[PDB]
Every structure is written in C-alpha cells, then in structure tokens.
Design an enzyme around this catalytic site. Sequence first.
Site, PDB file in Angstrom:
ATOM      1  N   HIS A  61       0.821  -1.203   0.000  1.00  0.00           N
ATOM      2  CA  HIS A  61       0.000   0.000   0.000  1.00  0.00           C
ATOM      3  C   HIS A  61       0.855   1.252   0.000  1.00  0.00           C
ATOM      4  O   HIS A  61       0.578   2.192  -0.750  1.00  0.00           O
ATOM      5  CB  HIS A  61      -0.926   0.016   1.234  1.00  0.00           C
ATOM      6  N   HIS A  91       5.143   6.787   7.174  1.00  0.00           N
ATOM      7  CA  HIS A  91       4.906   6.410   5.790  1.00  0.00           C
ATOM      8  C   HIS A  91       4.370   7.647   5.081  1.00  0.00           C
ATOM      9  O   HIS A  91       4.095   8.675   5.708  1.00  0.00           O
ATOM     10  CB  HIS A  91       3.886   5.272   5.703  1.00  0.00           C
ATOM     11  N   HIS A  93       1.758   9.140   1.602  1.00  0.00           N
ATOM     12  CA  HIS A  93       0.766   8.969   0.550  1.00  0.00           C
ATOM     13  C   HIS A  93       1.144   9.942  -0.559  1.00  0.00           C
ATOM     14  O   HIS A  93       1.575  11.061  -0.273  1.00  0.00           O
ATOM     15  CB  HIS A  93      -0.640   9.304   1.073  1.00  0.00           C
ATOM     16  N   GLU A 103      -3.707  13.482   1.486  1.00  0.00           N
ATOM     17  CA  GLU A 103      -4.978  12.999   2.009  1.00  0.00           C
ATOM     18  C   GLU A 103      -5.768  14.169   2.578  1.00  0.00           C
ATOM     19  O   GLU A 103      -6.873  14.467   2.111  1.00  0.00           O
ATOM     20  CB  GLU A 103      -4.706  11.901   3.036  1.00  0.00           C
ATOM     21  N   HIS A 116       3.032  10.847   7.205  1.00  0.00           N
ATOM     22  CA  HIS A 116       2.353  10.515   8.449  1.00  0.00           C
ATOM     23  C   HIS A 116       3.329   9.854   9.402  1.00  0.00           C
ATOM     24  O   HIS A 116       3.826   8.756   9.124  1.00  0.00           O
ATOM     25  CB  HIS A 116       1.194   9.567   8.176  1.00  0.00           C
ATOM     26  N   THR A 195      -6.588   6.425   8.007  1.00  0.00           N
ATOM     27  CA  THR A 195      -7.049   6.694   6.649  1.00  0.00           C
ATOM     28  C   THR A 195      -6.998   5.463   5.758  1.00  0.00           C
ATOM     29  O   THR A 195      -7.364   5.546   4.579  1.00  0.00           O
ATOM     30  CB  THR A 195      -6.260   7.824   5.988  1.00  0.00           C
TER      31      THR A 195
END
Length: 257
Positions: A61, A91, A93, A103, A116, A195
């Site tokens: 992911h 990590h 996004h 996000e 994050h 999330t």
Amino acid sequence: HWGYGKHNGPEHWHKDFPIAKGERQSPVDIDTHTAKYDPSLKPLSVSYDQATSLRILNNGHAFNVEFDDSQDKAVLKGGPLDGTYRLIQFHFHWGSLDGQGSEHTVDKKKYAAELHLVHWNTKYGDFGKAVQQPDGLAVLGIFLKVGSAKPGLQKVVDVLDSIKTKGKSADFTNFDPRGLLPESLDYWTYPGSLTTPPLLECVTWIVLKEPISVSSEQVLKFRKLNFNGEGEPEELMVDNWRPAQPLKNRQIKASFK
Ligand SMILES: CCc1c(F)c(F)c(S(N)(=O)=O)c(F)c1F
Ligand SMILES: OC[C@H]1O[C@@H](O)[C@H](O)[C@@H](O)[C@@H]1O
Ligand SMILES: [Zn+2]
C-alpha cells in the site's frame, strides 16, 4: 483485499469496514477560515533525538519506516495531547502527478504528498491496545510540495530500489526523522481515524501548516515503487491516498492566532 484501484479502492472499503461511513473519519478538508485558534492547546513537543529506526517495508500500500518503540525514545506530547505518544512508524501517501497525492487538503488544495508519523499513547501499553481506544493514536501529518530537494529524505529515496515490490523489506537503521520536519510547528488538530482499513476512529490528527519541499526527482522515485509482489505484473504504487471525508460533528482547531 483492499487497495486504491477502481475495484478495491476507497469507495469500496465500507463493505468490509462499515466504519468507513462513521462519525469521525479521516482525512478531511481543512477550511482555514473556519478553523479557530485554541488558546487551551499546550506547546507541542516533538522529541525525536533518540529515535531508533530499524527497517523499511513495502507493505503493498505504501512503505513504512519502522522504529523501535520498546521504550520511550522518539515521542510526541503537548498540543492537544494528554500524556505521551511513542513513534512506531512513518509512511507517505502520494500521487501519480504533482497536483494530487495528499490525504488532507487545505481549502481544497491537494499537495503532491503527505507524510504521516504514527504514534501510540503509552498509557495503553501497546499499539494493539491503543487502537481499541478513542485517544489511542496521534498522527503528525506533514504536506510535501515539489520544489527544492529535502536533504533528510534522500536516504529514504535511495533505499526504495531495494523494496520495489510488496513484501520486500530492508535494514534501515540510524535514520533521523528530524530531517523530515519543516521549520514551523504551527498546526491544525481534530479527532479522526486511520485513513487506511481498518479505518479505526482512534486518532488525534496534528497536521502541520508549513509543507516541506522535496524535489521532483525525489517524488518520482516514490512513483517507481510497485503495489504488486515480485514477479507479478507491474502496478505502479501511485495515488495511494484516501479523499477527504465528511467533517460531520467536528471542529478543526489551530495552534496559531
Ligand atoms: C495500522 C497502521 C496505520 C496505517 F497503516 C496508516 F496508514 C495510518 S494513517 N494513514 O492513518 O496515518 C495509521 F495511523 C496507522 F496506524
Ligand atoms: O459555546 C461556545 C463555544 O462553542 C464551541 O463550539 C467552540 O469550540 C468554542 O470555542 C466556543 O467557546
Ligand atoms: Zn497515512
């Protein structure tokens, strides 16, 4: 299983995880005009000097940089937080293009990526117990824009070629997360959720107002990662972000006047 594609992405998650339609889901759009300065917030304390990174993992992911959380080393406290929260992992996004990837949004603006840093409340003993509590987690979120390179990110960038596919990990000791922070700790805060599935409503979100700048070359290397495992057809790991969710009965508070 869940993912970010058309057939398994955010609009499908509610079937296996009905909390996806819950009362305190994340991320949200941060309406800067509506957020209100909160004089009851205490000074925020990001204490990362003794952080012990261990390993970096492609989980299919995103990638997680993992820390030794067996004792109080890298901790977050103050601000909206009651007590001490221990860093367990960070990590990101990110998008397929620079115009999307974050996000949280700021007055509907999407950043190129979002970092994050995940922390758990030490009063609950372990991460697993913490995610059974409404104040179990605190996530420090930091926006990324594309411009000048972030020198403290390059060590992460350069290891990604060794964890290209789902399930690969590599040693990642002696990484200093202080090199990922912007100058200012001005922030917005609100109660929310993970999330990603299982979308648990355990998180105090602390989202920094000042983005960090990373170079185009740095984010392009994020986009060379794969969602798939080794030997499987290549699906580039891009657009691994959940869109903004309904604010419902929440207020966003600002740390700055
Ligand atoms: C279960 C592990 C985990 C994540 F996978 C995750 F993506 C996030 S997030 N995006 O909300 O920061 C967490 F907080 C978290 F604890
Ligand atoms: O009743 C007044 C109060 O309303 C709340 O919704 C706000 O968060 C407070 O800042 C305000 O003092
Ligand atoms: Zn995240």
